[PDB]
């Protein structure tokens, strides 16, 4: 469940390309991309917190 996130917060982090071809600090910066699965599914870790208000 999401009870573990009650004491957590969103954070900002540096992003090498904010879509303009220039770098900036961004709320949607990626932390890691994991591809252990062989069926081609990707698992992406981001600074955003989804499903939590």
């Amino acid at each position: 469940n999401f009870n573990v996130y009650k004491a957590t917060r969103p954070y900002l982090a540096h992003c090498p390309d904010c879509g303009e071809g220039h770098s900036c600090h961004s709320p949607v910066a990626l932390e890691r991309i994991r591809n252990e699965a062989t069926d081609g599914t990707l698992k992406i870790q981001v600074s955003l917190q989804i499903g939590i208000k």
Partner: protein
Amino acid sequence: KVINNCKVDQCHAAVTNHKKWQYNSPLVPRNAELGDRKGKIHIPFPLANVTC
């Protein structure tokens, strides 16, 4: 708080009082040799054996 003597281009300020904790990302500076107010979040979506 009005300093009353110096110029805005001379001084630095930051927010220090925080109530919620965040992931200790490699893109965020550590505030101490060892991080404080430690908590843990489990990672969802484990790997499993299936047939394609």
